[PDB]
Amino acid sequence: GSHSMRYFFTSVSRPGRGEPRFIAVGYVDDTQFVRFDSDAASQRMEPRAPWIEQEGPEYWDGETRKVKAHSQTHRVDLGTLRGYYNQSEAGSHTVQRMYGCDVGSDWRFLRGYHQYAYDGKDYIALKEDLRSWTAADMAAQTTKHKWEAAHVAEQLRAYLEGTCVEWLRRYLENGKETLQRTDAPKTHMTHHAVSDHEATLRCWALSFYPAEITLTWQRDGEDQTQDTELVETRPAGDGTFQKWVAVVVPSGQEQRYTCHVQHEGLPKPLTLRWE
């Protein structure tokens, strides 16, 4: 299938004392493979998947240097944006950055992205053509002009369409045993009698990878949305994911309802029904 490499960066200023809390996480698809945490002792980019440990000392020195460069930029930005928004020095603020690249089944470049937020709101983002910027407000507009004059988009494009795609392909190969393995959901259904006339059917999907999945209820062969509940997909903690969907039904009518499961790891969609 298609694949992605994504990096997520968060800095939170500490007005009370010291430098911002800085946390970087790297993903291939839904697999975290590196992290940097300013609160950790190592002060190094650290491995979080076995297949990245194949990389030698030069890799780790380079990623450490570069991710520390990210943290300093974030620190400087927190100061700059505080001024742009005329904010006090007393408050804590947050900067968030995410960027990365998608490749298709053929591992050819598909898309690139780079977005930036201040205090949880869009600040500036690279457009889909990777040639121009979306600035949410007049502060971000100042940044946009600065980045245009310095041709940041062009430099970013060289990474996103070039180096980023080459890294992703390197990782997919090195980690193929897991990265290219699909874990179909382990499914089952539970039954809970809430009262004497209603029952809840819950359709479970467990231990699947990647995270993308569709759970739908049908009644007599038609999609049921009324009286259903779907939880957000959640990590199992072992690299796989979980999800469930439930429907309230009249007692004795359970047989009418079917749960339908779609996942890349499934050759055909699954259908479950309480009988």
């Binding site: 997520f8 968060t10 939170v12 946390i23 996480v25 975290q32 992290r35 945490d37 979080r48 804590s92 603020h93 947050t94 968030q96 995410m98 937020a117 205090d119 949880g120 709101k121 869009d122 539970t190 809970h192 819950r202 467990l206 939880v231 957000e232 959640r234 990590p235 199992a236 903690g237 072992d238 979980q242």
Partner: protein
């Protein structure tokens, strides 16, 4: 700033059986700012050896964290997740439900 209240899910990694080692998870998501307090409770008492994932966020910028600990479920032990956040006037407690 923006303030988004955390969604809380409390659950075991594996279907729970008494006497069989497992992992107790508290998944908090959809919140902002990232500053958050999360405790896992055993019969109302705070569990000390709890770890958490590295802070990350969704496309809409909202943060998520997995808090977890090893545990062995039993008949009468009760487990819960306790969360505090700027959006909450008091700590929100969510009980682990074997099924729900």
């Amino acid at each position: 700033m923006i303030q988004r209240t955390p969604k809380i899910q409390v659950y075991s990694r594996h279907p729970a059986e008494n006497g069989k080692s497992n992992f107790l998870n508290c998944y908090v998501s959809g919140f902002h700012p990232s500053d958050i307090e999360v405790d896992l409770l055993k019969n109302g008492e705070r569990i000390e050896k709890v770890e958490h994932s590295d802070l990350s966020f969704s496309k809409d910028w909202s943060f998520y964290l997995l808090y977890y600990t090893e545990f062995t479920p039993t008949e009468k032990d009760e487990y819960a997740c306790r969360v505090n956040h700027v959006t909450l006037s008091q700590p929100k407690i969510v009980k682990w439900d074997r099924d729900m």
